[PDB]
Amino acid sequence: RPTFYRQELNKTIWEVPERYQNLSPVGSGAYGSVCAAFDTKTGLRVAVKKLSRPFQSIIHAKRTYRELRLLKHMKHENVIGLLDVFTPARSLEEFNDVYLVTHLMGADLNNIVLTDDHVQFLIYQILRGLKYIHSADIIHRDLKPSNLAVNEDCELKILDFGLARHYVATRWYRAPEIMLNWMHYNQTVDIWSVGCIMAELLTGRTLFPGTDHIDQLKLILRLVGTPGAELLKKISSESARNYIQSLTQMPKMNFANVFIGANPLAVDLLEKMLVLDSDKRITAAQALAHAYFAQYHDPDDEPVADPYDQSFESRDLLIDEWKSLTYDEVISFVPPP
Ligand SMILES: CC(C)(C)c1c/c(=N\C(=O)Nc2cccc(Cl)c2Cl)n(-c2cccc(CC(N)=O)c2)[nH]1
Numbered sequence: 001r002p003t004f005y006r007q008e009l010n011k012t013i014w015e016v017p018e019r020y021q022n023l024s025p026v027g028s029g030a031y032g033s034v035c036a037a038f039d040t041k042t043g044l045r046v047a048v049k050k051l052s053r054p055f056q057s058i059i060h061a062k063r064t065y066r067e068l069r070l071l072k073h074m075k076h077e078n079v080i081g082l083l084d085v086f087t088p089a090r091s092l093e094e095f096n097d098v099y100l101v102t103h104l105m106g107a108d109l110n111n112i113v114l115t116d117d118h119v120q121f122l123i124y125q126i127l128r129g130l131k132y133i134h135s136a137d138i139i140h141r142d143l144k145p146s147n148l149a150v151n152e153d154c155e156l157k158i159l160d161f162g163l164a165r166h167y168v169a170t171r172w173y174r175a176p177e178i179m180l181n182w183m184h185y186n187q188t189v190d191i192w193s194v195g196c197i198m199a200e201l202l203t204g205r206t207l208f209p210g211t212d213h214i215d216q217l218k219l220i221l222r223l224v225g226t227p228g229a230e231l232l233k234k235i236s237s238e239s240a241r242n243y244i245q246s247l248t249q250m251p252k253m254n255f256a257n258v259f260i261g262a263n264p265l266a267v268d269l270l271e272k273m274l275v276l277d278s279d280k281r282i283t284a285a286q287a288l289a290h291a292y293f294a295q296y297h298d299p300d301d302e303p304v305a306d307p308y309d310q311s312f313e314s315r316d317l318l319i320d321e322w323k324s325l326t327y328d329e330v331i332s333f334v335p336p337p
Contacts, residue, residue, distance in 0.1 A: 004088055009035060014050055016099060017089045023048065030165025033064070034107050036104055039083075045104040046083065054098045054326070061322035064098055065312070067162065068329045071100060073136065073308050080149070080159035080190045109148035109197070110168060116263045117295075119201045124288070124296040125156040126194055129332055131284035133158065134187045136305035143193035143201065144173040171216050172196065172206050179213055179279055180243075182235040188281040195273030202262055224276050225252035231277045245263030265292040276313055 002017035010025045012033065022127055023035040032051040039046045054064040071082040084101035088094075109122070126148065133140060140147075142160055148167040149157040171179060175192035178185045199207040208223075210216025226249050227235070235241040255274075259267050269292045272282035282290075312325070 002086075005331055009033075011048070012052070014048075014099075015097070016048060017086060018099070018336035020046065020048060027163055029161075029165045031060075031162060031164045033163065034161065037101075039101070047102045049100040049102075049103045051098045051100075052122075053096075055096065055319050055323040058317075058319055058322070061319045061326070062317075065322050065326045065329070067100070068098070068326055069312070070138065072104075072333065073305070074133075076129055076132045076303065076305070078125045078134060078156060078158060080157050081336070082333070083336055085330050087327075087330055092324060095323065095327050098326065098330065102159075103166065103279065105149040105151050105155075107150055109145035109150050109156070109201075111168075112150045112154075113204065114201055116202075116266065117118060119198065119266065120202065120293055121154055121296060122148075122150065122156055123194065123198045124293045126158065126197065127284050127287050127293075128302055129156075129158040130190055130194065131288060131302060132305050134190070134284050138305075138308065139185075139187050140190050141178070142173075143190050143197070144168045144170055145197055148197075156286055169209075171210060171213060172208055174216070175278065176220050176276065177235075179216060180237075182237055182239050182240050184236070186278055188278040188283060191273050191281050191283065191287070192278075192323070195270055198266070198270060198273070201268060202259060217241050220276075221247065221250045223253050223255075223258065224274060226250045234277065234279070263292065265290070268292070 002019065004015050004017055006013055006015045007023065008014070009023055010028065014023055014035065019041040020037040021040060022038050025033065026036055027034040032049055034047050035048045037046045037048050047317070051064055053060065055061045068085060071080065073079050080102055082100065083103055086099050087097055089096060108278055130140070135318050139159065140158065147158065149159055172192040173196045175189040176181055178189045196207045203242070208216060208219040210219045226247055227244060232241060232244065235244060255267050255271050256264065259270060269287065269290050273287065275281040288297055
């Protein structure tokens with residue numbers, strides 16, 4: 001039973017425990033908003049995410065539940081972890097609000113903008129966290145520089161703000177198979193994104209700054225070329241395949257000529273990540289074993305996730321039921337050691 005306080009920031013009432021103080025707005029979108037706070041029970045600086053009308057729809061109530069489940073599951077140095085989760089409501093019937101708390105880590109990756117050595121370490125930690133996440137049958141799906149928390153010492157956490165924002169456009173970092181619904185995507189959609197980030201850290205430019213999905217694809221195929229017969233027949237979507245079949249043929253660009261003056265090991269890795277056929281794209285675990293990361297690679301300290309129960313994903317429930325599952329998850333939360 002902590003003593004909560006009401007307070008209003010920017011738009012909305014935040015009712016949170018007394019321990020958290022000096023809430024400062026950092027982010028708002030359709031799905032919620034984040035503040036920095038000080039936590040007086042630890043002395044450390046936190047992010048406090050308040051979801052907005054968590055249970056306003058089915059899709060929202062499940063999204064809410066999902067986030068709570070994911071964040072509770074994540075126990076990795078290179079991925080966001082849950083310090084606290086709370087609600088004012090002292091009953092399920094009262095429960096309308098969910099606040100998530102985490103260890104604030106400072107800038108994100110585009111604000112933190114870099115030696116080639118920095119690039120290795122950062123891209124190494126991305127892949128390290130990604131190997132973990134992928135090990136739980138989780139696809140991040142929105143991996144861009146704003147969803148990477150980096151501190152003073154270039155230590156990195158993967159997160160997802162997931163606020164619905166309106167600027168780092170998620171399409172800039174999206175693999176074309178998930179962007180244009182070519183086919184049944186896999187986890188390597190995240191590898192593509194890491195490729196774009198890596199590129200960007202090295203050149204300072206966004207790799208593919210497309211203005212929409214059509215421009216996006218244009219820009220992509222300029223570099224990687226248009227798909228051949230082989231990949232074309234993997235685009236199981238006919239409308240998507242017909243569109244591709246109609247584009248002007250583009251040759252793959254030799255990346256050594258594109259990423260001029262880059263560690264040739266970084267170029268080679270790029271080539272392996274920025275593969276259009278996700279059947280051929282390097283994976284997280286494999287990429288960690290690349291020579292680009294020799295200074296960091298340690299197969300003995302590149303850990304995998306405990307088993308993540310996503311049976312719920314196959315459920316069609318009512319708002320009230322998603323809301324009760326969420327509630328259960330809040331009460332069963334036990335903090336960090
Ligand atoms: C990296 C990983 C595990 C895929 C992840 C972290 C996360 N949530 C956050 O990272 N939230 C967050 C971000 C910044 C500050 C604070 Cl306090 C939080 Cl709780 N995720 C997340 C964010 C929003 C919604 C969902 C659920 C969904 N995808 O429908 C998950 N996803």
